[PDB]
Amino acid sequence: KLFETSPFDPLTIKNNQDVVDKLYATQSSSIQEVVPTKTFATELQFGVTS
């Protein structure tokens, strides 16, 4: 078997967002270069609203 857990089922996805989300869900079952944690923001601006 190539994979212990498949990265995703090819039939379930319908667009690129779906495959990105499936990768983000399944990444815990693979060796990760950087284990995810809280993200840190350095630049953030709010535009004026209607």
Partner: peptide, 30 residues
């Protein structure tokens, strides 16, 4: 644009290859 302000100690975030080839973000930069 925001590469100058990233501190040294924090851990870089890996991005999926799709988010690199086809990633788009809506951010005000003023």
């Amino acid at each position: 644009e925001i590469t100058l302000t990233v501190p040294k100690q924090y851990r870089p975030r890996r991005f999926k290859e799709i988010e690199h080839t086809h990633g788009y973000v809506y951010r005000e930069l003023n």
